[PDB]
Amino acid sequence: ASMKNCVIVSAVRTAIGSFNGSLASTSAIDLGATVIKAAIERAKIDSQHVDEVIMGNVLQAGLGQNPARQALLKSGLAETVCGFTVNKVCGSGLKSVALAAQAIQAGQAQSIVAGGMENMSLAPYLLDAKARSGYRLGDGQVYDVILRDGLMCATHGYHMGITAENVAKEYGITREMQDELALHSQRKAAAAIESGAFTAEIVPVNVVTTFVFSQDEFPKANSTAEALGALRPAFDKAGTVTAGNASGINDGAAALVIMEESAALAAGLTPLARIKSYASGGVPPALMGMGPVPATQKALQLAGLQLADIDLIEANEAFAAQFLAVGKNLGFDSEKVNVNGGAIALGHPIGASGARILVTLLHAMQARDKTLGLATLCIGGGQGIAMVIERL
Amino acid sequence: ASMKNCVIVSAVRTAIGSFNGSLASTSAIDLGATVIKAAIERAKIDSQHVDEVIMGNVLQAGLGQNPARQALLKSGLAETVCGFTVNKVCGSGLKSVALAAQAIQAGQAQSIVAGGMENMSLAPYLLDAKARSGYRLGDGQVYDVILRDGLMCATHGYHMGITAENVAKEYGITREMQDELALHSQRKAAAAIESGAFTAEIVPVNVVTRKKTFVFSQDEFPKANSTAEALGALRPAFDKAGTVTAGNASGINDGAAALVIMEESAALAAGLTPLARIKSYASGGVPPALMGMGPVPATQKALQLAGLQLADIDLIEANEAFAAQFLAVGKNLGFDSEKVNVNGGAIALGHPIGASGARILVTLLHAMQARDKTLGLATLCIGGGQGIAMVIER
Amino acid sequence: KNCVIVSAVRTAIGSFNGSLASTSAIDLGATVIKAAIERAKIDSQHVDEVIMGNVLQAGLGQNPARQALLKSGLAETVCGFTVNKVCGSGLKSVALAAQAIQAGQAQSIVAGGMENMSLAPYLLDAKARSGYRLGDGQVYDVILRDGLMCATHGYHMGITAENVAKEYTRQDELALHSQRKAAAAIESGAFTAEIVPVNVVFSQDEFPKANSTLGLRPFTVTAGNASGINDGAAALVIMEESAALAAGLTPLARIKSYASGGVPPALMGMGPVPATQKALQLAGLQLADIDLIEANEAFAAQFLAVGKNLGFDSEKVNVNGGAIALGHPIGASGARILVTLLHAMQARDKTLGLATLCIGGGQGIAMVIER
Amino acid sequence: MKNCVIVSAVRTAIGSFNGSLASTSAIDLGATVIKAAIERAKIDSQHVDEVIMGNVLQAGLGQNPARQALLKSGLAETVCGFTVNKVCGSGLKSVALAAQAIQAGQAQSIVAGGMENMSLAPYLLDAKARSGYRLGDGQVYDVILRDGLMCATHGYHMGITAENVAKEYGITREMQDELALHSQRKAAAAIESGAFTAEIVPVNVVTKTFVFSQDEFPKANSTAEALGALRPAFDKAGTVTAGNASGINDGAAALVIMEESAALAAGLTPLARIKSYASGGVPPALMGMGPVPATQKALQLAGLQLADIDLIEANEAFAAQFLAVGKNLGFDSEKVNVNGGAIALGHPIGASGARILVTLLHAMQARDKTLGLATLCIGGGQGIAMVIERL
Numbered sequence A: 001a002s003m004k005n006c007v008i009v010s011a012v013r014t015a016i017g018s019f020n021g022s023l024a025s026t027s028a029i030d031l032g033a034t035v036i037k038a039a040i041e042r043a044k045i046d047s048q049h050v051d052e053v054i055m056g057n058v059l060q061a062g063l064g065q066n067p068a069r070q071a072l073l074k075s076g077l078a079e080t081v082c083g084f085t086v087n088k089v090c091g092s093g094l095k096s097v098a099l100a101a102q103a104i105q106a107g108q109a110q111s112i113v114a115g116g117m118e119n120m121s122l123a124p125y126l127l128d129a130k131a132r133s134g135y136r137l138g139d140g141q142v143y144d145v146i147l148r149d150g151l152m153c154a155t156h157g158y159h160m161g162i163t164a165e166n167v168a169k170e171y172g173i174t175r176e177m178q179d180e181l182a183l184h185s186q187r188k189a190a191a192a193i194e195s196g197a198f199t200a201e202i203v204p205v206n207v208v209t210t211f212v213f214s215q216d217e218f219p220k221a222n223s224t225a226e227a228l229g230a231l232r233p234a235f236d237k238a239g240t241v242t243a244g245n246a247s248g249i250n251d252g253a254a255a256l257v258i259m260e261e262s263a264a265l266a267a268g269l270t271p272l273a274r275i276k277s278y279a280s281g282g283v284p285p286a287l288m289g290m291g292p293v294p295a296t297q298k299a300l301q302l303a304g305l306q307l308a309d310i311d312l313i314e315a316n317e318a319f320a321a322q323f324l325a326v327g328k329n330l331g332f333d334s335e336k337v338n339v340n341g342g343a344i345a346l347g348h349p350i351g352a353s354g355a356r357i358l359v360t361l362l363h364a365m366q367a368r369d370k371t372l373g374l375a376t377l378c379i380g381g382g383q384g385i386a387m388v389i390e391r392l
Numbered sequence B: 001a002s003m004k005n006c007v008i009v010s011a012v013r014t015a016i017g018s019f020n021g022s023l024a025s026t027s028a029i030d031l032g033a034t035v036i037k038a039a040i041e042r043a044k045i046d047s048q049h050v051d052e053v054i055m056g057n058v059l060q061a062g063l064g065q066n067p068a069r070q071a072l073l074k075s076g077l078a079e080t081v082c083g084f085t086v087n088k089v090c091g092s093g094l095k096s097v098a099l100a101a102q103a104i105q106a107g108q109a110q111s112i113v114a115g116g117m118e119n120m121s122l123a124p125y126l127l128d129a130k131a132r133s134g135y136r137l138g139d140g141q142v143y144d145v146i147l148r149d150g151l152m153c154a155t156h157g158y159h160m161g162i163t164a165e166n167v168a169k170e171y172g173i174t175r176e177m178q179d180e181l182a183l184h185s186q187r188k189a190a191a192a193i194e195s196g197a198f199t200a201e202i203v204p205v206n207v208v209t210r211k212k213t214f215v216f217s218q219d220e221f222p223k224a225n226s227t228a229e230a231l232g233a234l235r236p237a238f239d240k241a242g243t244v245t246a247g248n249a250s251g252i253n254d255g256a257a258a259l260v261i262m263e264e265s266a267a268l269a270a271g272l273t274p275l276a277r278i279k280s281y282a283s284g285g286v287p288p289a290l291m292g293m294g295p296v297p298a299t300q301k302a303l304q305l306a307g308l309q310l311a312d313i314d315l316i317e318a319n320e321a322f323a324a325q326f327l328a329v330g331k332n333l334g335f336d337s338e339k340v341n342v343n344g345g346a347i348a349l350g351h352p353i354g355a356s357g358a359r360i361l362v363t364l365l366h367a368m369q370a371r372d373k374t375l376g377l378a379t380l381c382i383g384g385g386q387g388i389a390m391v392i393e394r
Numbered sequence C: 001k002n003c004v005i006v007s008a009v010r011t012a013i014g015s016f017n018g019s020l021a022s023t024s025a026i027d028l029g030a031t032v033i034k035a036a037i038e039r040a041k042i043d044s045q046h047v048d049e050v051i052m053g054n055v056l057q058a059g060l061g062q063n064p065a066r067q068a069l070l071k072s073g074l075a076e077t078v079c080g081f082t083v084n085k086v087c088g089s090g091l092k093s094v095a096l097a098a099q100a101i102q103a104g105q106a107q108s109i110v111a112g113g114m115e116n117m118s119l120a121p122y123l124l125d126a127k128a129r130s131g132y133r134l135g136d137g138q139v140y141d142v143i144l145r146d147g148l149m150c151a152t153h154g155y156h157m158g159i160t161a162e163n164v165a166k167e168y169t170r171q172d173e174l175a176l177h178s179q180r181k182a183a184a185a186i187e188s189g190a191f192t193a194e195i196v197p198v199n200v201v202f203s204q205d206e207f208p209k210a211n212s213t214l215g216l217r218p219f220t221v222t223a224g225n226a227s228g229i230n231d232g233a234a235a236l237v238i239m240e241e242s243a244a245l246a247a248g249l250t251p252l253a254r255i256k257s258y259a260s261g262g263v264p265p266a267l268m269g270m271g272p273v274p275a276t277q278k279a280l281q282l283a284g285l286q287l288a289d290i291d292l293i294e295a296n297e298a299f300a301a302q303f304l305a306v307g308k309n310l311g312f313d314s315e316k317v318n319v320n321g322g323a324i325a326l327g328h329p330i331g332a333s334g335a336r337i338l339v340t341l342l343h344a345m346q347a348r349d350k351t352l353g354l355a356t357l358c359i360g361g362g363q364g365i366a367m368v369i370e371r
Numbered sequence D: 001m002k003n004c005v006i007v008s009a010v011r012t013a014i015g016s017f018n019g020s021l022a023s024t025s026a027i028d029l030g031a032t033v034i035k036a037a038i039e040r041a042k043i044d045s046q047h048v049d050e051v052i053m054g055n056v057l058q059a060g061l062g063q064n065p066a067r068q069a070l071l072k073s074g075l076a077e078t079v080c081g082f083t084v085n086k087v088c089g090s091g092l093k094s095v096a097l098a099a100q101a102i103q104a105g106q107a108q109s110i111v112a113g114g115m116e117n118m119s120l121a122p123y124l125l126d127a128k129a130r131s132g133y134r135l136g137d138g139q140v141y142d143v144i145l146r147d148g149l150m151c152a153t154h155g156y157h158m159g160i161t162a163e164n165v166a167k168e169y170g171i172t173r174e175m176q177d178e179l180a181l182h183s184q185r186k187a188a189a190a191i192e193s194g195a196f197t198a199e200i201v202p203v204n205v206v207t208k209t210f211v212f213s214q215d216e217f218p219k220a221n222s223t224a225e226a227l228g229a230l231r232p233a234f235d236k237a238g239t240v241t242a243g244n245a246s247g248i249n250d251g252a253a254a255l256v257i258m259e260e261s262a263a264l265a266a267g268l269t270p271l272a273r274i275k276s277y278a279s280g281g282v283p284p285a286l287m288g289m290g291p292v293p294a295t296q297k298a299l300q301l302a303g304l305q306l307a308d309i310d311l312i313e314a315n316e317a318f319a320a321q322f323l324a325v326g327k328n329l330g331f332d333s334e335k336v337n338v339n340g341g342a343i344a345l346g347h348p349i350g351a352s353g354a355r356i357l358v359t360l361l362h363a364m365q366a367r368d369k370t371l372g373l374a375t376l377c378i379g380g381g382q383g384i385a386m387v388i389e390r391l
């Protein structure tokens, strides 16, 4: 058979919650269900025609069987609709869209909802297996699942923040450079929020514990260079990486309806963009922040494009250090990158972020009438993922 | 571009450990690494040519970032080799192979190692989020991750064993029928083990502990001397008025499995020997309360995609999560029992949830080779009301 | 032998997660032990033992009373032990000091109690130690498991109060009365003599609710007509009478009698009835002979039922307010009330005093002192 | 001042860590011995004035373990009780308090002793669990260590205090292991001859179902070579091992204590008079030496010299400490722990003080001896001692 084209028919996200903030009482799965339902609605697709739901979720501990299937059931899709959960750490939410596109290209499905979901506020604490076989005698530890499964390197046993220090040293990214980038991201985020630039892409969340959450709350609107400069290093007393020039711990979800192109058109739907290419890359775990380099190079190669052809870029700001090193390595035109701000200001709900940046990318392309877009993120464990899309 | 054909070039598993048994000190990720390394070795592929590793794993709690990538790094593959972890509950290990096939069919890769890994003995316990925000005043709970994330229905709040009771009632599968099936699976397993039928497909695991060092290479969950009378004397495990017992249900187990999957022309160019072509795969959804019936829509769709009727299939691995569910699926679809689980099933062998989907595919292929059969079906039910199926061809 | 009180001191009582929430029970105990010694003017080298009540001993380390006495500056040759008779613990400790002195086994003891309910830990069951294996477990709030829940019936002390209320109405009038009396006592400086400051300088009871509002919701009994969860300590120096006089010390009161009583766990609030009857009998007294009474206000319901049963003259009871306003640091309260009782007797020049409190598990304890 | 007599004395067999009593709560063990002490004394149960029980690991055991134990034993709800914590001294302190109350005429009949189930001790999440961990790992604390076996002053194990004493008194590994073997041999000989049969009350254990009536911590088949091959338990350069230290154990013990005239008026048989008791303090770092001042004081109170004592139970928390105490006081070793000690029998901390008193009295009876001393060291730098006179 011939490979088929995949188009994005809707793209939506929740506002991103701060750690213990507005979404801290809404489960990852409920956040996923909200975005799945909204993506369906915004696509105008017949919900009975969804073939699969594919959601990224990193801190799956205690969330119950196959969080993606729970989210799809909660969204109102029929019990005949399949789904599965993806874990590629910070790449999860984009990998899920890549997998949806692959299934469609391969003619194995026609319509898939894909994205990701994370509630880091609600992540549990863990007793290791010794609790099951018996501690017997002597003290034990109670493990923060955010760190154990999300933010600590499983190869080296130190924080993602330490990998950022590793990259800063390897690429000569100073504290000053990192804090300047941070402030820039804050400023762009604040400008985007004030101008209503996120209004189209956000689906409100009703929080009943009662209020509507519809505005990204991680941005530090009173941010100043002097304040950023006064912060202490967060991970190494002699370091450059701080809470001010790193992304946060956050809650949120994002989802998109992906369809085979001819099927979308036959159903009378409006394709918003075509998925042109996607790819993953691997790097050393200690330099995980550089993952977007091989992933982006491969995605551009698969797309037949050069980096200069790309009109807009979302390159996730896990850490200013890594964001900058990736930029210097690849030679990004900074004016094209994270035009509405990035995760330093907006937050990093890890299993959702890959889909989140793709949503933001597409809407920013629409708003600015741009043709080609690149989304990429670094991935704990030494990986990266990238996707190229073409409006409309 | 055009769609490509995907072949299996190797297929391997660990022996399956009992709960707190021989693999109880060997992490899921280490079990995954062992099978990845062995699948690569057995395929004779150049290890530098692996494009991705895709592994199933259900109980990811506390295992660290992206268990699959950990396992691939531990296997000795280069840091440039990507990977990710899949969770479709009991379907995970077969879904991983399906995804590897799809990627190859779509021309996105040429060579993938896929399968699954689970160590249920080492699953942790959880404090819920109240521990993070503060319990304040009043008691909390401590949650068994096997149950919360593996064996309890997230829709209904009751065990997979209760979904089996549901199916038994809906399909008229009695205690007697269930125990007769159990005894059959025990018998077939025992025969296969003793005769060496699993020798080819198993990679030994070296187990090193303070108190002992040894090589684990024989499935240890089977219950020799299982008898109809003994099985009949067991108490129901999940409902005091029920039919499902520990004797007619699979276990909680540890193990891993993996296969090397390749684009056909690439395999032949490398002088490698394709063992089977992946003909089709599919997933199906059913009500969560009847999750045990998942294999019905998944099998129907896979057969349709393959252009086959069920009768065309020579050998079938239909996972025995519960005798009740296995039997109802068999009755619904009309399985020829002589074709099914010819070397025994999970009631005897065990059910390491994130690995089983790949485990049964390994077993299926080796049984097809041994018996010179052309078409095979692997299918499993999936907690949450799903099923997954794959058709392969020698 | 005769036993006398030579000093009596307490900390101000802290609110749950309030001013004393960072100060360990043992550091609170050490403060009151040191202060009792100082106020008594006794040679510290002559202390024979320290006896301290403490209910939530979980995770506090070996023998909290000994830790507290060492922290107070007493020599390592000074022995001590920890008592648990739930809410009775602090008074039981004094009764035990008196008994030892009466029996000529000691001449000078510091006794009282200490509790920090804010700092109480959470517990995994023993199944954690032997292994959960399969299936969920529970994580237990030690305030509830060891302090506030009935070990016979598995329900709150608050439910025993509902039991008593039904046996003997929506309590709020009594609550307001206690608040008013407490506020008056505090503002006028009535607690100044009995309180030792704690440098965290916390020196004023913070649980009172000025401007109370009561008429909410009920676990009916409400938070407004029940005592609180609280932190504090109290201690007294107790001596053999002739020794105190020979050393040039000033006796403040004689301990005339003490007793403990048992009742059904479900009606534990009524414990003070048999304890009081027995203590009065032992003292050769009738209730009417008592000038001032401290009857702890664990719950308005229980306090009122005890009052109606025994026939307390309400004008004589908790004259500076009670635990509904002041709080209820469980292992310390028994000693805390005795401190308050003595100082109130001194201020009003009264001769005979009764202190009594109810005890989870269906007990009571009472003490009669003579100024 | 009135005279106080022991009218019964009983104990459970001592369970090993995670052994035969590991499913039987401290409180249930307490109730068993309270009921049995009452039965063996032939007292009218309605005449019990109080129950006083030692228990060190009270964490999670519920309001006032002693009162729970008395209620479970079948005593009326009018019978008061309270729980005593003097670490390893708790069980003997409970008897001393019973005697004191009786001497002071505040009671006539008290059941006293102690109870501990170290197997069932819980783990703790600290107060951070109540306010919220927020972000970052925490710890889970073994209550046996935190509340039982670690020094609250120095933050190191009781085993380290034993290393401290060994150094201070020149007690070598060789000396410690020789004492350990002796205790094992004596315990094995006692068990073989039925010497503990009179003092033990069986426990029915229902899980399999069985009757536990024999001390299971002794290592019959113990040998010098085996003991010598053990690694130090607490300090990689140390002398103290699991073989020359007592264990972590489960058990309970209780005695009926009465005013002498009341016992005789009730037609009961006094078994011994409590002659004196005393507690002593020493530095926390040298807690193992507690029995020195406690014993000296108890003898002085009794008007006796050490040589007047016929039989001695001196608890074997650690061979190092036991030997140092012996050398300091000048014990006649032939008089000490004649049926073995805690190195063989175990050390259920809140019960051991009462346990050794029970063993003492029955050994005195079996050997027709007149004067007996029971003494133990106490974590935190204390000791306690009691002198009794048969009969």
Ligand SMILES: CC(C)(COP(=O)(O)OP(=O)(O)OC[C@H]1O[C@@H](n2cnc3c(N)ncnc32)[C@H](O)[C@@H]1OP(=O)(O)O)[C@H](O)C(=O)NCCC(=O)NCCS
Residues within 6 Å of the ligand: A137, D088, D149, D158, D159, D219, D222, D223, D226, D227, D230, D233, D241, D242, D243, D244, D245, D246, D247, D248, D317, D318, D347, D349, D377, D378, D379
């Ligand atoms: C010393 C310690 C920590 C040992 O406990 P554990 O760590 O459980 O060690 P155990 O498992 O009992 O013994 C360690 C080894 O010594 C061995 N052992 C002990 N006594 C032995 C003997 N008499 N003959 C042969 N082997 C012996 C055990 O068999 C064990 O070997 P395995 O691992 O092969 O089974 C001990 O139980 C303890 O803490 N005792 C002191 C209690 C205390 O401090 N009480 C308060 C006093 S103030």
Ligand SMILES: CC(C)(COP(=O)(O)OP(=O)(O)O)[C@H](O)C(=O)NCCC(=O)NCCS
Residues within 6 Å of the ligand: A090, A151, A160, A161, A234, A242, A243, A246, A247, A248, A249, A318, A319, A348, A350, A378, A379, A380, D135
């Ligand atoms: C620890 C800090 C750096 C700062 O958080 P704190 O709560 O300690 O500090 P404040 O937010 O209270 O200022 C931060 O939230 C953090 O963890 N950053 C890294 C999270 C992150 O970006 N993870 C992706 C890995 S690629």
Ligand SMILES: CC(C)(COP(=O)(O)OP(=O)(O)O)[C@H](O)C(=O)NCCC(=O)NCCS
Residues within 6 Å of the ligand: B090, B151, B160, B161, B237, B245, B246, B249, B250, B251, B252, B321, B322, B351, B353, B381, B382, B383, C134
């Ligand atoms: C509860 C039993 C039946 C038996 O385990 P136990 O440890 O309780 O049994 P014993 O070893 O005492 O016989 C069993 O381990 C079990 O849960 N089996 C089902 C596992 C299962 O539900 N797998 C997923 C199916 S879709």
